[PDB]
Write a protein that binds this ligand. Structure first.
Ligand SMILES: Nc1ncnc2c1ncn2[C@@H]1O[C@H](COP(=O)(O)OP(=O)(O)OP(O)(O)=S)[C@@H](O)[C@H]1O
Ligand SMILES: Nc1ncnc2c1ncn2[C@@H]1O[C@H](COP(=O)(O)OP(=O)(O)OP(O)(O)=S)[C@@H](O)[C@H]1O
Ligand SMILES: [Mg+2]
Ligand SMILES: [Mg+2]
Ligand SMILES: [Zn+2]
Ligand SMILES: [Zn+2]
Lengths: 343, 366, 364, 366, 215
């Protein structure tokens, strides 16, 4: 079984076409690109017939088996596509896939899409049956460290010029959402035929800043930017961002900060960041908080966060925005009365 | 609008006009029949934005011209429920229609006739009159091979081709093909059109087997059919139908002749125990011998043997029993001829003495 | 009659569109260069012009002159599209038609070539309400779309759509209309409508719009109806006051200055209308918290509270923090004790009295 | 087990045994019928834990005693598919059954016969015999009035009352009642029992119009019917049934004799445009006349005027058109005597020619 | 076969009940004066005789002799109601019939006249389990019931019911039985059953009852 990345899929297809192709990952954009490339290559080879089905407990495998067995008078060279469940195949799905792999023909080109398979899922009869005649392409969203490389490559293949500041702004605004970033790049190219994308142009484009980025608010809190954090929180409130998502992100960051603060009384902050595999870009802002808030802070903040989380888990109150603003000022160097923290 | 008619003269045309209608229409107006009284003639029209059916009735009693739209099923039920030989008097009062028959009175809601869609006129290209029998034969021969629901829309219809003095009907769905052809006695220019499933169904239904000739007009994208006082207009599907000639085998080396009834009974018996999910059977053909076998995952096996006229080398070939049974049912003849070359090639089925109708079946991978 | 301002003032040209430059310019450049994609999606808040921009794009695509970003507006195609009678433009309301059977019939029409247009345009609205089978059918259609068809999508909940559907279309997000642009649009609309107006009324309507042009037009229609065919500052001020009901802020201000009579009058006024006492206490607590946050940092107050910005700023500047903290603690205790009070009104009155004249004795 | 039997002699018993078996037995053993060869007879039994059907076929060919369980559907299909006049030889080998006949061979799976459920014995309190025609008439006179799925369990079955020299059948659903009585020619003690609707349907299918008398036995909570070589056993609901006499109007004054044929035709004509949700229509019983007015939510008037034999003061009464139509269909008479006491009270619809049968219909407050 | 004391000793007459003097007096006065309402609701804690009082009222309303506060207990209607197989008394278990479709079907049949009794009584139990749609559907007919139907409601958590339903019926609240009343009733039952007992055992049982006679 060959293993590849999206960039090498085109080269592999140029070298030859294999019987089965597996697309496992959690990145819809890369999976769609790989599927489109494979289908285009198959159509060039003479595959003008395509079929797609969704795998679920209420699945009509009889139709698939009939299609595999049935021939075609003129429209030969069939292509079949399967969409696995998000959870993954079960024993019934395992045996169904084994039976389908048993009924394979040279004129049938099989494609499978789904999430990454675990060791138990990997160790399956159907999976091993295709080991000698299959290629799997891994398609997952890169981390922020590898994000700017991908952004630069995508801009380059579109015949566009991006400045370093513009690349950083694009990565910050569309972290974890490659589809939105690609759409933004396309819109920028449409706006400017010359293709020169300077920092002011993207900054004007960033004026949109639609929603879904509470990490910006959390980073503003970590940087001690009271004005920026308050503004971003207000924009999120206007956008109706799920307060639970903000609470969970700030909870992760605050737990990490509390652990670092407690264990840094005998260790340097940078060593602890290395221990926790923290990203250097984050390490900065985190450090600022760890160098801006005493141990008394990050404890009243923890109390407020825990009370708000319990209230939202039991009461589901919509006043969570005011509590979030209070916690925002608490995370800054503002003394705060400590009475608004219910203490 | 006022008129008076007889139950017998109105029962059949009303049924013909109201037959297509059913279910929940896209618009309420489409669910009603358009009645028009003019110059001693009652016109009943029914359409569904894809096809139109028009019937005409002669009036020999005092009447008033007009136009209206009335419910189809309710009006048909009212007409049918009256005693045989009764006289039905229809009048229009305000937004209501009053129907009187002896001492029976009905009031029905109506809608403006101006809202009834009307198809735009078009110019025909090829006009020809043929007996109803030929059309019925072609339809019954080539209807069962049409696809039900496929992405390729042109396969859902039937290909009608006029060539010289011959009319040919072809149907296929990617796995089986049926072709039939009959002469018409008149020379017409070469032409080909595609008829949808509903149009074929309506054309089959409107035929009654009578001596009245069927007149067919074919235009750029529309087809009209006249039978007596019934007019049926339909649209044509746009596409490029596959060429059936290439489908037929070029040189089938092996031939076989078998009794239709015995072969059909053997196939049915084999299919009784065959796998329901696949409905697949296996045929072993040898010198003057044909063996049919079937099996299911429950390890139950069914086997049958019969004698046929065969002289080729022994062969094993898989098939889908459904297609073979359908072909045998379509061919009502004492003997059937099967021509084939190998186990991975299409098999041609024809009548022993008639070559008008032919079928092509693609073997299953087995 | 006089029609509705929103209905009568649908943007019929790209110039008439208010704001949204980043989308209009991109669409114009794409049309000019011929770079047209198969599937387009529009996202944003209510009343931002997604449907209007989609209709303008559809009109531009199938104009007689050609594919241009500036439709002539005089050819038969433009007139039919404006009237909505264009044959090749199919508008679908996904909310009304959600079942797979309804969508399948509409999607099966792609087989037929366009009748009187270069492209067969499908404009689906509220597409987020489609069923799973409907989404599957749409994905099947969009996998291999004919070259002569285009799909336009508009919704306010893009997250509801499957990732597969999103990945195969170009998405444009629309922003708010600010305040000055809304004011200018309202001024132009009223000038064309021959309806008397005043600058202050327009400014108040724009402020109350809160970035939505449809809301601004609805408020303008309300002012016209209440103003008896005329827009006036007094009419708009009364209209807004009918929707203000600022008894909570008045109560807070009265309590901070220790004015019992005003507090009692405001309590009676609030009790005149149906209000939840616990909700009133929560609102007062939130106002006190916001005042404290503003005192800690001026940036705490945002644009969401622009209506009462001046009063909040004055309270933050004037009142010492200690009084705010004491009042907040007293109101917290009052909220805690409210459930077991003889009545909600009695509990609120007792808590307000305690805040006015009493000071708790903390332990130690 | 081994026995050869003629196909024709085995056709009807197999169908009769398979009748009671349902499509979804929910147990593999239930779906399989019990076949027992003993002495010179073959017994086929089918049960569903509520009813039992037993058929016996005489054997003339050599055979061995045995018992087994075989699928009803597959065996019946195999038996019916064979050509007429064929002789079926059935043998048991291990877990399989050979059904070899002529050139065809089959291998049907079998299950142990010990697992087949059996019904405990019971004592017959009453025994009698009546002609098939009388039982068929009694069941047909009141089958339609049985409740389909009413919450009251006891209303889902028919009440059989043997009294004096007569047998009576009663059915009802809380809104309509049907009663029929027929002499039996033999005095029996007063007794009342309740039979489920499925049992009534099975008994109806059992009857074939033959001259062999039907023998009926009734115990504490069970009923048995014997005819020819067929035996049927069923349980009893064991509940209370409302007395028909109380439901029956007492000395009604109006005795409207209506024209059953035209009466029901007019009722159907009104029902065409009647309220679909409620199926209610207004009967204006006027002097020697009836005006059946039906009005639907569409407000389409369906006033039908007919001539009846009314002689009392004119009265308007609202009735469910479906119930009246069903009663008229069940009557199958010439004149229908609707005996009425008042507008709000129930109407006793009797057959004018025969007073043995009767029905009670409750009105509605429209 | 064997029946517990709770089922065996269900009161069958207005004089056989314990406590709730105000409710009995009000019902007797209403029946005697002829002022009969079309909607009665009973509220209170568990095991206070709401169902028993409702059944007694149903027996009184449909008694053959007439509308009286002292049912004979010997006519056919009384026996049928006591044995729980009376045709015109329809008992609904709202705990399992919360579907609005069931309520609509029940309401569609109100137009039909009663079979035997002079009134058609509906006794809905645990009505607090009905859905909001069921309450809304009921509202209209409950506001205008025909002259030949009556509605009886028994509930233990009246707070859940909407104010609209509450305002459309006469409400009767049952007071929890006192310890002395429970002790006296237990002593009377044991004396009737001829079972030896001691005062302290009765006192302990009454104290552990906690105001519930069923307990
Ligand atoms: N950008 C805009 N320029 C001018 N008028 C606008 C604009 N956006 C909205 N309007 C006004 O608001 C009315 C309704 O706009 P729509 O386009 O229907 O709102 P919307 O964005 O489609 O909201 P949805 O998608 O239906 S929830 C229009 O008829 C205009 O009067
Ligand atoms: N007031 C009472 N007088 C006499 N016995 C009573 C009384 N209340 C309860 N009981 C006894 O307790 C049993 C149950 O009483 P119920 O009629 O169920 O009271 P209840 O309030 O309806 O209980 P719920 O609400 O259904 S839990 C009766 O069968 C009697 O044995
Ligand atoms: Mg819109
Ligand atoms: Mg109770
Ligand atoms: Zn134009
Ligand atoms: Zn009595």
């Amino acid at each position: 079984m060959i293993r590849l990345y999206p960039e090498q899929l085109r080269a592999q297809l140029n070298e030859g076409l294999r019987a089965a192709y597996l697309l496992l990952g959690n990145d819809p954009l890369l999976l769609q690109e790989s599927q489109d490339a494979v289908r285009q290559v198959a159509a060039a080879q003479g595959f003008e017939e395509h079929h797609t089905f969704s795998i679920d407990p209420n699945t009509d495998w009889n139709a698939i088996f009939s299609l595999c067995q049935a021939m075609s008078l003129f429209a030969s060279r069939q292509t079949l596509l399967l969409l696995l469940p998000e959870n993954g195949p079960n024993a019934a799905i395992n045996e169904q896939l084994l039976t389908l792999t048993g009924l394979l023909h040279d004129d049938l080109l099989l494609i499978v899409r789904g999430n990454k398979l675990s060791k138990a899922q990997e160790n399956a009869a159907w999976f091993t049956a295709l080991a000698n005649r299959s290629v799997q392409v891994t398609c997952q969203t890169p981390e922020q460290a590898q994000l700017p490389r991908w952004v630069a490559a995508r801009a380059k293949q579109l015949n566009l010029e991006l400045d370093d500041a513009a690349n950083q702004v694009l990565c910050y605004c569309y972290e974890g959402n490659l589809l939105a970033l690609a759409q933004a790049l396309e819109r920028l190219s449409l706006l400017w035929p010359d293709g020169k994308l300077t920092l002011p142009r993207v900054e004007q484009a960033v004026n949109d800043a639609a929603h879904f980025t509470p990490f910006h608010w959390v980073d503003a809190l970590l940087m001690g930017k009271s004005k920026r954090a308050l503004h971003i929180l207000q924009q999120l409130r206007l956008e109706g961002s799920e307060p639970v998502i903000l609470l969970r992100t700030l909870q992760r960051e605050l737990l990490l900060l509390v652990n670092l603060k407690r264990q840094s009384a005998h260790t340097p902050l940078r060593a602890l960041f290395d221990k926790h595999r923290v990203w250097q870009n984050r390490r900065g802002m985190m450090g600022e908080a760890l160098n801006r808030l005493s141990q008394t802070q990050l404890r009243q903040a923890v109390q407020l966060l825990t009370r708000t989380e319990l209230t939202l888990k039991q009461d589901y109150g919509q006043s969570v925005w005011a509590e979030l603003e209070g916690l925002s000022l608490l995370l800054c160097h503002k003394p705060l009365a400590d009475v608004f923290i219910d203490g | 609008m006022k008129f008076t008619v007889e139950r017998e003269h109105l029962l059949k045309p009303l049924q013909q006009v109201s037959g297509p209608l059913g279910g929940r229409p896209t618009l309420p107006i489409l669910g009603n029949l358009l009645l028009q009284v003019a110059d001693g003639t009652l016109s009943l029209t029914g359409t569904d934005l894809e096809m139109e059916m028009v019937a005409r009735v002669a009036l020999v009693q005092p009447h008033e011209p007009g136009a209206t739209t009335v419910p189809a099923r309710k009006f048909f039920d009212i007409c049918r429920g009256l005693p045989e030989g009764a006289e039905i008097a229809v009048q229009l009062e305000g937004e209501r229609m009053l129907v009187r028959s002896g001492r029976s009175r009905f009031s029905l809601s109506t809608l403006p006739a101006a809202d009834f869609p009307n198809l735009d006129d078009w110019q025909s290209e090829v006009e020809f009159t043929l007996p109803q029998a030929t059309m019925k034969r072609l339809i019954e021969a080539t209807q069962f091979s049409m696809a039900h629901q496929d992405v390729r829309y042109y396969l859902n219809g039937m290909l009608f081709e006029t060539e010289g003095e011959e009319l040919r009907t072809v149907a296929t769905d990617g796995h089986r093909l049926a072709v039939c052809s009959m002469p018409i006695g008149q020379s017409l220019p070469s032409h080909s059109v595609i008829v949808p499933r509903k149009g074929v169904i309506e054309l089959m239904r409107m035929l009654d087997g009578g001596d009245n000739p069927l007149r067919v007009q074919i235009g750029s994208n529309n087809i009209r059919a006249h039978v007596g006082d019934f007019i049926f207009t339909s649209k044509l599907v746009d596409g490029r139908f596959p060429d059936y000639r290439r489908v037929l085998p070029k040189n089938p080396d092996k031939h076989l002749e078998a009794g239709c009834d015995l072969l059909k009974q053997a196939f049915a018996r084999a299919a009784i125990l065959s796998n329901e999910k696949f409905r697949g059977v296996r045929l072993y053909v040898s010198e003057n011998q044909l063996k049919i076998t079937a099996n299911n995952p429950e390890q139950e096996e069914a086997e049958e043997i019969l004698d046929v006229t065969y002289s080729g080398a022994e062969m094993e070939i898989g098939f889908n029993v459904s297609y073979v049974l359908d072909v045998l049912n379509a061919l009502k003849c004492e003997n059937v001829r099967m021509m084939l070359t190998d186990s991975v090639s299409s098999v041609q089925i024809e009548d022993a003495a008639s070559q008008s109708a032919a079928y092509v079946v693609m073997p299953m991978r087995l | 009659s006089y029609q509705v301002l929103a209905r009568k003032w649908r943007p019929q040209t790209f110039a008439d569109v208010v704001g949204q430059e980043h989308v209009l310019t991109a669409l114009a450049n794409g049309l000019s260069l011929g770079r047209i994609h198969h599937a387009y999606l529009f996202s944003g808040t209510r009343g931002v012009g997604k449907t209007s921009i989609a209709r303008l794009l559809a009109k531009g695509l199938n104009c007689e002159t050609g594919i241009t970003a500036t439709p002539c507006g005089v050819c038969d195609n433009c007139r039919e599209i404006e009237q909505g009678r264009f044959v090749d433009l199919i508008e679908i309301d996904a909310a009304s038609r959600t079942k797979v059977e309804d969508t399948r019939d509409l999607l099966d029409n792609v087989q037929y070539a366009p009748a009187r247009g270069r492209f067969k345009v499908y404009l689906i609205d509220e597409v987020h309400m489609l069923s799973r089978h409907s989404f599957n059918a749409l994905l099947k259609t969009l996998e291999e779309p004919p070259e002569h068809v285009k799909f336009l999508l508009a919704t306010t909940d893009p997250q509801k759509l499957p990732v597969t559907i999103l990945s195969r279309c170009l998405q444009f997000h629309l922003k708010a209309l600010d305040v000055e642009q809304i004011r200018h649009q309202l001024e132009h609309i009223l000038n064309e409508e021959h309806i008397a107006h005043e600058p202050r009324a327009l400014q108040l309507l724009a402020r109350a719009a809160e970035g939505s042009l449809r809301d601004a037009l609805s408020l303008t229609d309300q002012a016209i109806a209440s103003g008896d065919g005329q827009v006036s500052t007094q009419a708009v001020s009364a209209m807004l006051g009918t929707l203000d009901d600022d008894q909570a802020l008045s109560l807070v201000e009265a309590m901070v200055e220790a004015n019992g009579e005003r507090v009692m009058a405001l309590i009676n006024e609030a009790a005149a209308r149906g209000i939840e006492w616990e909700a009133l206490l929560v609102e007062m607590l939130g106002l006190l918290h916001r005042i404290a946050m503003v005192q800690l940092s001026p940036a705490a107050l945002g644009n969401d509270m622009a209506a009462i910005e001046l009063r909040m700023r004055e309270l933050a500047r004037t009142i010492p923090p200690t009084d705010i903290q004491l009042y907040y603690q007293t109101l917290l205790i009052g909220r805690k004790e409210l459930p077991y009070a003889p009545d909600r009104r009695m509990g609120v009155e007792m808590t307000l009295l305690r805040a006015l004249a009493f000071h708790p004795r903390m332990p130690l």
